[PDB]
Design a protein around this ligand. Structure first.
Ligand SMILES: [Mg+2]
Ligand SMILES: [Zn+2]
Ligand SMILES: [Zn+2]
Ligand SMILES: [Zn+2]
Lengths: 65, 56, 8, 138, 49, 92, 119, 99, 56, 49, 101
DNA sequence: AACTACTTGAGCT
RNA sequence: AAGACCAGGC
DNA sequence: AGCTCAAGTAGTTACGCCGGTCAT
């Protein structure tokens, strides 16, 4: 259901960081926690933001018209 | 429970939860505990309106 | 009570 | 599988844990009153005593149970054969109906065929047994 | 009835495990009473072990 | 292959089920002061083992974290409120 | 008690008195058969049972996995594989002594220590 | 438990105290259909009956003795006569039916 | 406390044996019936009063 | 946050926390009679009734 | 209790057993009905003595024996003398009864 | 589901 | 528009 | 023919306040 712009908790932007993350996984083969850390996601408030998103939009997109 | 030897009159069989919530119930303990609470919930869902009659 | 003891 | 009747069998046991008349009677489908087990047996195909106790009890050395049965035997001592057996269940007109309620109503599972009278008898025996197995705290 | 059952038992049980008497059927031996329970019935809740 | 069996409630009566597959088995020739105190497996009569105890739960509790740490009557409540939270019931 | 039936028409046996000779008879009320008394005992009630504690113990009672294991040693074969339980007499007032069966005999030794039994 | 009614059961039921002083034989259980006046018989699907408030049921035929139509049976989604039973991931997304 | 969680464990172990003990002493008929109670009932009456005081 | 009432951080409620869509579907038909008398779906006004 | 006797332990019991309804049924381990036609000796061993020792300081040949419980006679507390005494006066002159000590 | 009311039934002189 | 049934709330 | 005593059988009434779906 798409990525959440800015973290609820503190406010820091986080829209862009989606693809960066979902990428540092598939290829650079780095575990969750670490990916985030380099993506610049420090305190858990924003951390949980990314590490918990379940991108439904993908499946929704699989529908026709 | 079927996980027990017949005629076991001990406490670990008759429902004595030796554990603390901080530690956590074992299946057996966890179950009995449920059967116990289940009785509780029961009357809180029975004495609720029969009490109201007696009141009325 | 129920989930603590008999008497309780 | 087939129609599916909802009629139950009652194998009672009169006489509370005291009174002298501790008899055993059972209820059949469509029969107004109740019948004392002995007759149900002779009416089935077992006419002599001890051949009746044959089915109920499986251990000649269990006098207690057997004792219990005694008073019962006396109940039916008045009907001595398959003729009368199927009768007392209320002539010629009544006797015929007696059969019916045994081949299509009595413990109808097992089968409602015909030549299996024997089988149902061992059940009603396994039943009268189960009754006592308890009334004797076992 | 049946004479020595100990085997009648551990044969049916070997029959189910190969799968020649539906894994859904129930077979209970109550030695403590001398009886053999057979259940095909529809509506018996069961779990796996 | 006879590695697992379907035990109805009746047949259950005449079997002996072992909880944890591991522990309730190997011999004995100390322990952690944290985990819950576990009794034993003083028996070798076992006929079956439990796929997993956390399987005695149904859909509801299955989503409850550490249901083995709350007052049972509470778990029973969450067991109901779940059927009343928000989310996605299908994608279509 | 262990009462009797009768040859001829296999039935129940009712007792009658040998007036003139003073002794007990048993009979039948379907035919005529008549036999003397087997024992002077006729009827018993028994209010404090004790028969049925040994409840059917087929040798296979060592194959019922749901039963406990004690490592004692029978009063005869001196083994160490016994199974047990409590009376099967479902009486809220019964007692709790253990009856043991041995995988090496089929004896019936107790744990009691105020009485003694062989049944 | 559903398949057990269709597959087997359903048969034993039609074949018992049938024959009339005219008997019955095997019975046919087709897949979803929609018999509407102003159209033939449209092979129906879940997600539609849903929107149009219809009935996801199919036909019943019986080889009657002296082939014959007798009622519309409401099928069980995700069962066997329900087309869903086969379609895969991608297959479904097209029927608009959530996988 | 680190040691208190221990001091308790063994207040259940010992309490467990003060049960195993009166169970041995019952599975021997080595106890008399407190007037008005069944030999069995009187067995419980103690097990209960044992676990309760333990737990307490 | 007393007596089971909780305090929720408005700020993040704005950043969309716990927001949810709500749908609804009112539905209707055009009833008829074997006796050709049908209903209508229009934008009615005045007209004698 | 009555005014006086208050912390009288044994006084408590002394009233208990004067109130708590006790019936023959609660002290009888078993009852049998033997055939003994000779009113001057038994067909039973463990009874012999009990006859001879009961003829110093008409009937039916049909017998009825009762085997009371020992531990049960200490609980509700009872006496053969009493027990029977009661029995006897219950039926009276149309039932001769005897008992051991 | 449990009771309590009301009237009826069968045993008994 | 009135009713019935299921569901759910403290 | 008539009367007390026990049992059966009949019948009744029960619960605080607050959306969906179906059909006469
Ligand atoms: Mg509230
Ligand atoms: Zn943040
Ligand atoms: Zn004869
Ligand atoms: Zn031995």
């Amino acid at each position: 259901m798409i990525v959440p712009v800015r973290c609820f908790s503190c406010g820091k932007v986080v829209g862009d960081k989606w693809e960066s993350y979902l990428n540092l996984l598939q290829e650079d083969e780095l575990d969750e926690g670490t990916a985030l850390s380099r993506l610049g996601l420090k305190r858990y408030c924003c951390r949980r933001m990314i590490l918990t998103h379940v991108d439904l939009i993908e499946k929704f997109l699989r529908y026709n018209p | 429970l079927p996980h027990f030897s017949k005629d076991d009159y001990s406490p670990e069989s008759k429902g004595f939860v030796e554990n603390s919530y901080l530690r956590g119930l074992t299946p057996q303990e966890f179950f009995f505990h449920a059967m116990g609470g289940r009785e509780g919930l029961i009357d809180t869902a029975v004495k609720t309106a029969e009490t109201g009659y007696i009141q009325r | 009570n129920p989930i603590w003891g008999i008497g309780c | 599988k087939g129609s599916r009747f909802i009629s139950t069998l009652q194998v009672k046991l009169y006489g509370r844990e005291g009174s002298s008349a501790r008899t055993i009677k059972a209820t059949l489908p469509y029969i107004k009153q109740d019948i004392p087990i002995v007759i149900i047996f002779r009416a089935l195909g077992i006419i002599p005593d001890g051949e009746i106790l044959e089915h109920i009890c499986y251990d000649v050395n269990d006098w207690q149970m057997l004792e219990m049965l005694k008073p019962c035997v006396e109940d039916g001592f008045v009907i001595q054969d398959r003729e009368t057996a199927l009768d007392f269940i209320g002539k010629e007109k009544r006797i015929q109906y007696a059969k019916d309620i045994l081949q299509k109503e009595f413990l109808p599972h097992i089968t409602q065929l015909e030549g299996f009278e024997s089988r149902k008898a061992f059940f009603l025996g396994y039943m009268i047994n189960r009754l006592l197995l308890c009334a004797l705290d076992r | 009835v049946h004479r020595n059952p100990a085997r009648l038992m551990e044969t049916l049980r070997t029959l189910r495990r190969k799968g020649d008497i539906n894994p859904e059927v129930s077979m209970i031996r109550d030695i403590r009473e001398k009886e053999l329970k057979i259940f095909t019935d529809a509506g018996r809740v069961y779990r796996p072990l | 292959e006879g590695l697992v069996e379907y035990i109805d409630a009746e047949e259950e009566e005449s079997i002996l089920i072992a909880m944890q597959p591991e522990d309730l088995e190997p011999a004995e020739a100390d322990v952690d002061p944290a985990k819950r105190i576990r009794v034993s497996h003083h028996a070798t009569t076992f006929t079956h083992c439990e796929i997993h105890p956390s399987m005695i739960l149904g859909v509801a509790a299955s989503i409850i974290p550490f249901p083995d740490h709350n007052q049972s009557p509470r778990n029973t409540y969450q067991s109901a409120m779940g059927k009343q939270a928000m989310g996605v019931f299908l994608t279509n | 008690t262990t009462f009797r039936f009768c040859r001829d028409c296999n039935n129940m046996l009712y007792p009658r008195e040998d007036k003139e000779n003073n002794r007990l008879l048993f009979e039948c009320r379907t035919c005529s058969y008549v036999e003397e008394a087997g024992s002077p005992l006729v009827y018993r009630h028994e209010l404090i049972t004790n028969i049925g504690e040994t409840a059917g113990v087929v040798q296979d009672i060592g194959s019922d996995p749901t039963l406990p294991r004690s490592d004692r040693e029978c009063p005869k074969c001196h083994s160490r594989e016994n199974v047990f339980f409590q009376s099967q007499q479902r009486r809220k007032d019964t007692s709790m002594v253990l009856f043991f069966v041995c995988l090496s005999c089929s004896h019936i030794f107790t744990s009691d220590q105020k009485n003694k039994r062989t049944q | 438990s559903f398949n057990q009614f269709v597959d087997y059961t359903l048969q034993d039921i039609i074949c018992e105290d049938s024959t009339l002083i005219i008997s019955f034989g095997k019975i046919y259980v087709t897949k979803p259909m929609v018999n509407e006046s102003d159209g033939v018989t449209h092979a129906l699907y879940p997600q539609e009956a849903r929107l149009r408030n219809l009935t996801y049921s199919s036909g019943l035929f019986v080889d009657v003795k002296k082939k014959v139509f007798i009622g519309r049976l409401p099928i069980m989604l995700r069962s066997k006569n329900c087309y869903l039973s086969e379609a895969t991931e991608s297959d479904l997304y097209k029927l608009k039916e959530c996988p | 406390d680190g040691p208190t969680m221990r001091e308790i464990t063994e207040t259940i172990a010992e309490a467990k044996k003060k049960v195993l003990d009166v169970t041995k002493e019952a599975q021997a008929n080595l106890l008399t019936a407190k007037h008005g109670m069944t030999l069995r009932e009187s067995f419980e009456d103690n097990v209960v009063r044992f676990l309760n005081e333990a737990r307490d | 946050n007393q007596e089971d009432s909780m305090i929720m951080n408005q700020s993040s409620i704005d950043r969309g926390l716990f927001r949810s869509l709500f749908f609804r579907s009112y539905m209707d038909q055009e009833k008829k009679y074997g006796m050709s008398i049908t209903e209508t779906f229009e934008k009615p006004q005045r007209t004698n009734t | 209790l009555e005014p006086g006797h208050a912390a009288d332990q044994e006084q408590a019991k002394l009233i208990r057993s004067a109130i708590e309804h006790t019936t023959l049924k609660s002290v009888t381990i078993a009852s049998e009905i033997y055939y003994d036609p000779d009113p001057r000796s038994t067909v039973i061993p463990e009874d012999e003595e009990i006859i001879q020792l009961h003829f110093s300081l008409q009937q039916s040949p049909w017998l009825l024996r009762l085997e009371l419980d020992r531990a049960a006679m200490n609980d509700k507390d009872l006496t053969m003398g009493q027990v029977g005494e009661r029995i006897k006066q219950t039926f009276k002159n149309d039932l001769f009864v005897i008992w051991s000590e």
